[PDB]
């Protein structure tokens, strides 16, 4: 019943809440070391470098919470010109959000809390209309926005990118790569009335090196075309599987023979879009639909968990470090303060420093709790 994308959205709210308290806490502590340092009748209870540190952490942490809020999961599709890239995309969003046929630039599909479908382009924030400007409009990206109220995936922080045929483009496999580098999952949409090409395999060889251990799915689309032929279907499947397994397991070495059974699917996007646009059959239609729904399930488990790790961990780590250093600073103020009536200013200094350090520990415990739920194995 429960979309595994929920995992990413929950992680996102935790780390955003934690960083909200971190900025609050470090602002509080920054005023304290400032007060202590600037107090004329104190010798060197808090130093100027104590203060430059805190202010630095202060300036950092605001913009950190400013980024994770915009953090989303990204899936990018590749394949030859009529393999069914946009159809797979439209099948996952239960609607014809993108049109088949052609263009030659990337198309992302985002969510809007807003209610009308629309389209933006590069360096212009004017909201052009969804599908009339579709035909018309060193890479090139146009961004489609569809109402989050019409698709769970877009509600749940997923962005889906369409790429131009890998057939028809070289200038290399490079601006493609710096459109992709954000991406948590790469889907190869292959035409199953055909055979896995080397122009498609080479692009993924590029991604394989430039990025460490990418998640890749192979969708053998158009599996209609091979329908009704139950034993012919079994033997064609075997050959596609043998070529796909080889690529993932022995060529890209990106996965082992077993988990690769969870990366290769035989699917008919057209059929799925139909039965889904339908909520107002050839042989094996339901079987096909179930395999597509298995892929979606497995894909969501994979992208949710992966994107939590590669988009939130290093901020978690960095926050632990910030908290560590600020404990050191509280520790040293408390210590310098232990070495008339000045005495009761220092003891009050000492009490507030301990207050602060125990706040640091409290926040440290939450970070550690976050890492337990969301970052195995802590
Ligand atoms: N028969 C059949 N046609 C399909 C299937 N998937 C896509 N198509 C058709 O193939 C053509 C090109 O598909 P499209 O989704 O635009 O592929 P793309 O251009 O690579 O994004 C369109 O006419 C689609 O309706 C399928 O599973 N079966």
Tab-separated table of C-alpha atoms and ligand atoms in Angstrom:
chain	number	residue	atom	x	y	z
A	1	UNK	CA	0.000	0.000	0.000
A	2	UNK	CA	2.872	2.418	0.802
A	3	UNK	CA	5.139	4.032	-1.832
A	4	UNK	CA	8.795	3.600	-0.805
A	5	UNK	CA	9.362	7.224	-1.941
A	6	UNK	CA	7.837	8.007	1.439
A	7	UNK	CA	11.163	7.000	2.900
A	8	UNK	CA	12.937	9.848	1.121
A	9	UNK	CA	10.346	12.423	1.964
A	10	UNK	CA	10.455	11.473	5.651
A	11	UNK	CA	14.268	11.621	5.703
A	12	UNK	CA	14.030	15.016	4.094
A	13	UNK	CA	11.772	16.453	6.784
A	14	UNK	CA	13.945	15.081	9.588
A	15	UNK	CA	17.217	16.541	8.276
A	16	UNK	CA	15.458	19.849	7.536
A	17	UNK	CA	14.054	19.980	11.062
A	18	UNK	CA	17.464	19.022	12.578
A	19	UNK	CA	19.225	21.707	10.556
A	20	UNK	CA	16.578	24.190	11.640
A	21	UNK	CA	17.589	23.528	15.275
A	22	UNK	CA	21.241	23.524	14.378
A	23	UNK	CA	21.100	27.049	12.963
A	24	UNK	CA	19.051	28.101	15.974
A	25	UNK	CA	21.524	26.521	18.381
A	26	UNK	CA	24.601	27.845	16.683
A	27	UNK	CA	23.147	31.333	16.501
A	28	UNK	CA	22.440	31.134	20.232
A	29	UNK	CA	25.957	29.889	21.017
A	30	UNK	CA	27.476	32.445	18.669
A	31	UNK	CA	26.008	35.311	20.722
A	32	UNK	CA	27.366	33.737	23.918
A	33	UNK	CA	30.992	33.507	22.734
A	34	UNK	CA	30.606	37.002	21.341
A	35	UNK	CA	29.397	38.356	24.681
A	36	UNK	CA	32.135	36.531	26.543
A	37	UNK	CA	34.889	37.646	24.173
A	38	UNK	CA	33.810	41.273	24.009
A	39	UNK	CA	33.410	41.600	27.810
A	40	UNK	CA	36.191	44.114	28.761
A	41	UNK	CA	36.614	42.767	32.279
A	42	UNK	CA	37.418	39.295	30.994
A	43	UNK	CA	40.983	38.404	30.114
A	44	UNK	CA	40.756	35.664	27.495
A	45	UNK	CA	37.765	33.514	28.441
A	46	UNK	CA	36.680	33.415	24.810
A	47	UNK	CA	39.016	34.274	21.958
A	48	UNK	CA	38.475	36.046	18.663
A	49	UNK	CA	39.058	32.785	16.774
A	50	UNK	CA	36.305	31.223	18.913
A	51	UNK	CA	34.007	33.913	17.526
A	52	UNK	CA	35.145	33.774	13.900
A	53	UNK	CA	34.457	30.017	14.022
A	54	UNK	CA	30.893	30.320	15.330
A	55	UNK	CA	30.035	33.135	12.905
A	56	UNK	CA	31.392	31.004	10.072
A	57	UNK	CA	29.262	28.020	11.145
A	58	UNK	CA	26.354	30.425	11.480
A	59	UNK	CA	26.778	31.706	7.889
A	60	UNK	CA	27.111	28.137	6.575
A	61	UNK	CA	24.149	26.435	8.224
A	62	UNK	CA	21.483	28.801	6.912
A	63	UNK	CA	22.290	28.063	3.276
A	64	UNK	CA	22.464	24.332	4.078
A	65	UNK	CA	18.843	24.223	5.177
A	66	UNK	CA	18.203	26.338	2.111
A	67	UNK	CA	19.462	23.525	-0.110
A	68	UNK	CA	18.106	20.232	1.333
A	69	UNK	CA	14.633	21.811	1.025
A	70	UNK	CA	15.132	21.814	-2.749
A	71	UNK	CA	16.512	18.269	-2.725
A	72	UNK	CA	14.617	15.730	-4.770
A	73	UNK	CA	15.071	12.264	-6.291
A	74	UNK	CA	15.991	12.176	-9.977
A	75	UNK	CA	15.492	9.417	-12.525
A	76	UNK	CA	16.883	9.740	-16.043
A	77	UNK	CA	15.848	7.658	-19.070
A	78	UNK	CA	18.062	6.828	-22.046
A	79	UNK	CA	17.598	4.898	-25.292
A	80	UNK	CA	17.219	4.981	-29.061
A	81	UNK	CA	14.781	7.347	-30.699
A	82	UNK	CA	11.594	5.255	-30.528
A	83	UNK	CA	12.238	2.755	-27.739
A	84	UNK	CA	9.491	4.254	-25.612
A	85	UNK	CA	11.304	6.674	-23.282
A	86	UNK	CA	8.445	9.194	-23.030
A	87	UNK	CA	5.913	6.347	-22.943
A	88	UNK	CA	7.598	4.805	-19.893
A	89	UNK	CA	7.618	8.236	-18.279
A	90	UNK	CA	3.915	8.752	-19.062
A	91	UNK	CA	3.120	5.285	-17.742
A	92	UNK	CA	4.689	6.007	-14.332
A	93	UNK	CA	2.827	9.353	-14.178
A	94	UNK	CA	-0.645	7.868	-14.907
A	95	UNK	CA	-1.222	10.215	-17.875
A	96	UNK	CA	0.098	11.470	-21.225
A	97	UNK	CA	2.278	14.167	-19.660
A	98	UNK	CA	4.837	14.005	-22.489
A	99	UNK	CA	4.147	13.447	-26.158
A	100	UNK	CA	5.670	10.762	-28.358
A	101	UNK	CA	7.853	11.988	-31.180
A	102	UNK	CA	10.284	14.748	-31.943
A	103	UNK	CA	12.643	17.136	-30.260
A	104	UNK	CA	16.279	17.131	-29.348
A	105	UNK	CA	16.821	18.368	-25.844
A	106	UNK	CA	16.292	17.104	-22.338
A	107	UNK	CA	12.864	17.225	-20.692
A	108	UNK	CA	12.568	17.068	-16.926
A	109	UNK	CA	9.163	16.570	-15.331
A	110	UNK	CA	8.691	18.179	-11.881
A	111	UNK	CA	5.864	18.745	-9.445
A	112	UNK	CA	3.780	21.845	-8.825
A	113	UNK	CA	1.731	22.515	-5.730
A	114	UNK	CA	-0.005	24.704	-8.274
A	115	UNK	CA	-2.813	23.398	-10.400
A	116	UNK	CA	-2.221	23.985	-14.095
A	117	UNK	CA	0.350	22.132	-16.158
A	118	UNK	CA	3.078	24.361	-17.511
A	119	UNK	CA	6.528	24.602	-18.953
A	120	UNK	CA	9.641	26.678	-18.417
A	121	UNK	CA	12.893	26.895	-20.286
A	122	UNK	CA	16.381	28.076	-19.586
A	123	UNK	CA	17.125	31.412	-18.007
A	124	UNK	CA	13.623	32.722	-18.273
A	125	UNK	CA	11.178	32.119	-15.477
A	126	UNK	CA	8.168	32.819	-17.629
A	127	UNK	CA	5.548	30.116	-17.340
A	128	UNK	CA	4.897	29.008	-20.960
A	129	UNK	CA	1.955	26.573	-21.511
A	130	UNK	CA	2.450	22.828	-21.253
A	131	UNK	CA	1.845	21.294	-24.683
A	132	UNK	CA	1.568	23.946	-27.423
A	133	UNK	CA	5.160	25.079	-26.913
A	134	UNK	CA	6.230	21.421	-26.740
A	135	UNK	CA	6.771	20.975	-30.483
A	136	UNK	CA	8.781	24.116	-30.849
A	137	UNK	CA	11.056	23.932	-27.878
A	138	UNK	CA	26.210	22.668	-25.027
A	139	UNK	CA	22.977	20.929	-23.989
A	140	UNK	CA	19.323	21.963	-23.906
A	141	UNK	CA	16.718	21.365	-21.172
A	142	UNK	CA	13.053	22.241	-21.018
A	143	UNK	CA	11.242	21.593	-17.728
A	144	UNK	CA	7.680	20.314	-17.597
A	145	UNK	CA	5.661	20.858	-14.420
A	146	UNK	CA	2.601	18.736	-13.634
A	147	UNK	CA	0.212	19.050	-10.703
A	148	UNK	CA	1.360	16.971	-7.771
A	149	UNK	CA	-2.332	16.261	-7.217
A	150	UNK	CA	-2.427	14.119	-10.337
A	151	UNK	CA	0.558	11.778	-9.597
A	152	UNK	CA	1.889	10.288	-6.321
A	153	UNK	CA	5.494	10.222	-7.625
A	154	UNK	CA	5.574	13.986	-8.281
A	155	UNK	CA	3.896	14.610	-4.926
A	156	UNK	CA	6.685	12.549	-3.330
A	157	UNK	CA	9.689	14.547	-4.602
A	158	UNK	CA	10.520	12.598	-7.783
A	159	UNK	CA	11.776	14.324	-10.940
A	160	UNK	CA	11.877	12.352	-14.203
A	161	UNK	CA	14.229	13.322	-17.040
A	162	UNK	CA	13.819	12.397	-20.707
A	163	UNK	CA	16.920	12.513	-22.952
A	164	UNK	CA	17.278	12.735	-26.732
A	165	UNK	CA	17.865	9.492	-28.659
A	166	UNK	CA	21.357	8.089	-27.900
A	167	UNK	CA	21.047	6.959	-31.425
A	168	UNK	CA	21.212	10.372	-32.922
A	169	UNK	CA	23.662	12.265	-30.762
A	170	UNK	CA	27.336	12.490	-30.188
A	171	UNK	CA	29.037	15.792	-29.772
A	172	UNK	CA	29.927	12.961	-27.450
A	173	UNK	CA	28.297	11.674	-24.302
A	174	UNK	CA	29.257	14.629	-22.154
A	175	UNK	CA	26.714	17.458	-21.746
A	176	UNK	CA	24.412	14.514	-21.360
A	177	UNK	CA	26.734	13.593	-18.463
A	178	UNK	CA	26.463	16.993	-16.794
A	179	UNK	CA	22.710	16.829	-17.122
A	180	UNK	CA	22.880	13.409	-15.466
A	181	UNK	CA	25.300	13.837	-12.570
A	182	UNK	CA	22.368	14.763	-10.285
A	183	UNK	CA	20.685	11.427	-11.146
A	184	UNK	CA	20.045	8.669	-8.643
A	185	UNK	CA	18.789	6.095	-11.148
A	186	UNK	CA	19.472	5.596	-14.875
A	187	UNK	CA	16.898	3.643	-16.936
A	188	UNK	CA	17.860	2.111	-20.249
A	189	UNK	CA	14.745	1.781	-22.365
A	190	UNK	CA	15.516	-0.857	-24.961
A	191	UNK	CA	13.441	-1.912	-27.944
A	192	UNK	CA	12.833	-5.624	-27.565
A	193	UNK	CA	11.960	-6.273	-31.220
A	194	UNK	CA	15.620	-5.345	-31.505
A	195	UNK	CA	18.926	-6.100	-29.736
A	196	UNK	CA	20.907	-4.127	-27.141
A	197	UNK	CA	23.247	-1.844	-29.180
A	198	UNK	CA	26.783	-0.683	-28.442
A	199	UNK	CA	25.956	3.008	-28.843
A	200	UNK	CA	23.613	2.552	-25.927
A	201	UNK	CA	26.168	0.506	-23.957
A	202	UNK	CA	28.946	3.109	-24.457
A	203	UNK	CA	26.997	5.928	-22.916
A	204	UNK	CA	26.565	3.855	-19.789
A	205	UNK	CA	30.271	2.994	-19.803
A	206	UNK	CA	30.845	6.759	-19.590
A	207	UNK	CA	28.445	7.152	-16.677
A	208	UNK	CA	29.981	4.088	-15.012
A	209	UNK	CA	33.390	5.672	-14.593
A	210	UNK	CA	32.575	9.364	-14.177
A	211	UNK	CA	30.187	8.381	-11.325
A	212	UNK	CA	30.714	5.641	-8.732
A	213	UNK	CA	28.391	2.570	-8.713
A	214	UNK	CA	25.295	3.982	-10.480
A	215	UNK	CA	21.861	2.405	-10.207
A	216	UNK	CA	20.802	1.178	-13.610
A	217	UNK	CA	17.633	-0.455	-14.827
A	218	UNK	CA	17.112	-2.041	-18.211
A	219	UNK	CA	13.549	-1.813	-19.538
A	220	UNK	CA	12.981	-4.067	-22.561
A	221	UNK	CA	9.966	-2.213	-23.844
A	222	UNK	CA	7.502	-3.055	-26.649
A	223	UNK	CA	7.101	-6.512	-25.191
A	224	UNK	CA	3.656	-6.503	-26.916
A	225	UNK	CA	5.305	-7.201	-30.221
A	226	UNK	CA	6.387	-10.589	-28.920
A	227	UNK	CA	3.038	-11.549	-27.481
A	228	UNK	CA	0.877	-14.598	-28.008
A	229	UNK	CA	3.926	-16.670	-28.669
A	230	UNK	CA	4.434	-18.317	-25.379
A	231	UNK	CA	7.453	-20.489	-26.090
A	232	UNK	CA	8.899	-18.165	-28.673
A	233	UNK	CA	8.457	-15.510	-25.994
A	234	UNK	CA	10.396	-17.642	-23.510
A	235	UNK	CA	13.315	-18.075	-25.878
A	236	UNK	CA	13.470	-14.434	-26.910
A	237	UNK	CA	13.401	-13.460	-23.246
A	238	UNK	CA	16.297	-15.753	-22.537
A	239	UNK	CA	18.430	-14.095	-25.199
A	240	UNK	CA	17.613	-10.572	-24.131
A	241	UNK	CA	18.293	-11.606	-20.541
A	242	UNK	CA	21.631	-13.130	-21.451
A	243	UNK	CA	22.690	-9.965	-23.245
A	244	UNK	CA	21.401	-7.680	-20.513
A	245	UNK	CA	22.922	-9.699	-17.644
A	246	UNK	CA	26.271	-9.689	-19.413
A	247	UNK	CA	26.233	-5.917	-19.774
A	248	UNK	CA	25.225	-5.108	-16.191
A	249	UNK	CA	27.181	-7.867	-14.449
A	250	UNK	CA	30.272	-8.499	-16.572
A	251	UNK	CA	30.649	-5.345	-18.663
A	252	UNK	CA	29.704	-2.558	-16.233
A	253	UNK	CA	30.331	-4.822	-13.206
A	254	UNK	CA	27.774	-2.604	-11.537
A	255	UNK	CA	25.787	-5.461	-10.022
A	256	UNK	CA	26.016	-9.229	-9.449
A	257	UNK	CA	24.128	-11.923	-11.409
A	258	UNK	CA	21.459	-12.174	-8.734
A	259	UNK	CA	20.520	-8.576	-8.014
A	260	UNK	CA	20.576	-8.089	-11.783
A	261	UNK	CA	17.350	-10.157	-11.908
A	262	UNK	CA	15.929	-7.102	-10.173
A	263	UNK	CA	17.281	-4.697	-12.770
A	264	UNK	CA	15.968	-6.180	-16.018
A	265	UNK	CA	12.336	-6.074	-17.085
A	266	UNK	CA	10.159	-6.918	-20.071
A	267	UNK	CA	7.463	-4.371	-20.328
A	268	UNK	CA	4.924	-2.672	-22.576
A	269	UNK	CA	4.572	0.937	-21.706
A	270	UNK	CA	1.805	1.516	-24.148
A	271	UNK	CA	-0.308	-1.063	-22.453
A	272	UNK	CA	0.362	0.356	-18.989
A	273	UNK	CA	-0.433	3.947	-20.024
A	274	UNK	CA	-3.725	2.714	-21.523
A	275	UNK	CA	-4.964	0.847	-18.429
A	276	UNK	CA	-3.944	3.821	-16.302
A	277	UNK	CA	-5.270	6.730	-18.335
A	278	UNK	CA	-8.385	4.539	-18.320
A	279	UNK	CA	-9.371	4.909	-14.717
A	280	UNK	CA	-11.502	7.520	-16.422
A	281	UNK	CA	-6.361	-7.525	-23.765
A	282	UNK	CA	-3.715	-9.285	-25.772
A	283	UNK	CA	-2.420	-12.499	-24.312
A	284	UNK	CA	-0.339	-11.846	-21.201
A	285	UNK	CA	-1.483	-8.265	-20.731
A	286	UNK	CA	-1.992	-8.654	-16.999
A	287	UNK	CA	1.336	-10.480	-16.707
A	288	UNK	CA	3.026	-7.609	-18.501
A	289	UNK	CA	1.291	-5.068	-16.241
A	290	UNK	CA	2.366	-6.905	-13.119
A	291	UNK	CA	5.994	-6.930	-14.266
A	292	UNK	CA	5.801	-3.173	-14.817
A	293	UNK	CA	4.367	-2.813	-11.311
A	294	UNK	CA	7.201	-4.994	-9.992
A	295	UNK	CA	9.726	-2.742	-11.714
A	296	UNK	CA	8.094	0.394	-10.260
A	297	UNK	CA	8.142	-1.102	-6.776
A	298	UNK	CA	11.789	-2.169	-6.998
A	299	UNK	CA	12.748	1.139	-8.662
A	300	UNK	CA	11.166	3.161	-5.847
A	301	UNK	CA	12.894	1.102	-3.115
A	302	UNK	CA	16.191	1.668	-4.919
A	303	UNK	CA	15.918	5.395	-5.657
A	304	UNK	CA	14.501	6.375	-2.254
A	305	UNK	CA	17.252	4.682	-0.280
A	306	UNK	CA	20.040	5.660	-2.650
A	307	UNK	CA	19.054	9.349	-2.806
A	308	UNK	CA	18.834	9.646	0.997
A	309	UNK	CA	22.442	8.468	1.211
A	310	UNK	CA	23.984	10.501	-1.560
A	311	UNK	CA	22.069	13.689	-0.871
A	312	UNK	CA	21.915	13.864	2.933
A	313	UNK	CA	24.841	11.962	4.445
A	314	UNK	CA	27.604	14.459	3.917
A	315	UNK	CA	25.547	17.229	5.450
A	316	UNK	CA	24.841	14.906	8.382
A	317	UNK	CA	28.544	14.216	8.694
A	318	UNK	CA	29.345	17.914	8.429
A	319	UNK	CA	26.831	18.786	11.124
A	320	UNK	CA	28.362	16.212	13.492
A	321	UNK	CA	31.698	17.919	12.896
A	322	UNK	CA	30.284	21.435	13.477
A	323	UNK	CA	28.689	20.192	16.723
A	324	UNK	CA	31.981	18.550	17.741
A	325	UNK	CA	33.962	21.761	17.240
A	326	UNK	CA	31.393	23.835	19.120
A	327	UNK	CA	31.572	21.409	22.088
A	328	UNK	CA	35.320	22.005	22.076
A	329	UNK	CA	34.714	25.726	22.155
A	330	UNK	CA	32.219	25.468	24.976
A	331	UNK	CA	34.685	23.194	26.783
A	332	UNK	CA	37.501	25.660	26.479
A	333	UNK	CA	35.444	28.660	27.615
A	334	UNK	CA	34.298	26.671	30.648
A	335	UNK	CA	37.932	25.803	31.377
A	336	UNK	CA	39.430	29.245	30.924
A	337	UNK	CA	36.670	30.507	33.203
A	338	UNK	CA	37.787	28.134	35.961
A	339	UNK	CA	41.247	29.743	36.001
A	340	UNK	CA	36.293	38.832	43.910
A	341	UNK	CA	32.856	39.264	42.389
A	342	UNK	CA	34.127	38.717	38.902
A	343	UNK	CA	33.950	35.142	40.228
A	344	UNK	CA	30.135	35.046	39.799
A	345	UNK	CA	30.277	36.418	36.285
A	346	UNK	CA	32.617	33.504	35.463
A	347	UNK	CA	30.458	30.939	37.238
A	348	UNK	CA	27.528	32.244	35.230
A	349	UNK	CA	29.701	32.035	32.116
A	350	UNK	CA	30.478	28.481	33.136
A	351	UNK	CA	26.785	27.634	33.621
A	352	UNK	CA	25.699	28.946	30.231
A	353	UNK	CA	28.546	27.131	28.514
A	354	UNK	CA	27.395	23.848	30.019
A	355	UNK	CA	23.839	24.675	28.962
A	356	UNK	CA	25.124	25.127	25.437
A	357	UNK	CA	27.311	21.995	25.421
A	358	UNK	CA	24.380	19.869	26.603
A	359	UNK	CA	22.346	21.333	23.752
A	360	UNK	CA	25.150	20.242	21.442
A	361	UNK	CA	24.960	16.706	22.821
A	362	UNK	CA	21.161	16.699	22.456
A	363	UNK	CA	21.487	17.709	18.807
A	364	UNK	CA	24.285	15.118	18.371
A	365	UNK	CA	21.849	12.438	19.617
A	366	UNK	CA	19.312	13.433	16.998
A	367	UNK	CA	21.865	13.336	14.221
A	368	UNK	CA	22.779	9.864	15.442
A	369	UNK	CA	19.122	8.878	15.503
A	370	UNK	CA	18.737	10.225	11.982
A	371	UNK	CA	21.707	8.211	10.815
A	372	UNK	CA	20.103	5.087	12.327
A	373	UNK	CA	16.793	5.375	10.509
A	374	UNK	CA	18.076	6.689	7.234
A	375	UNK	CA	21.774	5.927	6.864
A	376	UNK	CA	22.509	2.212	7.335
A	377	UNK	CA	24.917	1.029	8.474
A	378	UNK	CA	25.769	3.832	10.958
B	1	LIG	N1	3.229	-1.349	-29.857
B	1	LIG	C1	3.882	-0.626	-28.933
B	1	LIG	N2	4.206	0.650	-29.218
B	1	LIG	C2	4.860	1.428	-28.334
B	1	LIG	C3	5.224	0.874	-27.040
B	1	LIG	N3	5.842	1.857	-26.364
B	1	LIG	C4	5.886	2.946	-27.168
B	1	LIG	N4	5.278	2.684	-28.338
B	1	LIG	C5	5.117	3.579	-29.507
B	1	LIG	O1	6.397	3.850	-30.098
B	1	LIG	C6	6.419	5.171	-30.635
B	1	LIG	C7	7.579	5.946	-30.028
B	1	LIG	O2	7.519	5.797	-28.605
B	1	LIG	P1	8.060	6.950	-27.630
B	1	LIG	O3	7.418	6.769	-26.273
B	1	LIG	O4	7.848	8.356	-28.163
B	1	LIG	O5	9.628	6.591	-27.582
B	1	LIG	P2	10.761	7.722	-27.408
B	1	LIG	O6	10.670	8.674	-28.576
B	1	LIG	O7	12.129	7.080	-27.340
B	1	LIG	O8	10.475	8.528	-26.156
B	1	LIG	C8	5.064	5.768	-30.294
B	1	LIG	O9	4.240	5.565	-31.442
B	1	LIG	C9	4.541	4.925	-29.149
B	1	LIG	O10	3.115	4.814	-29.092
B	1	LIG	C10	4.836	-0.530	-26.805
B	1	LIG	O11	5.112	-1.099	-25.737
B	1	LIG	N5	4.188	-1.193	-27.770
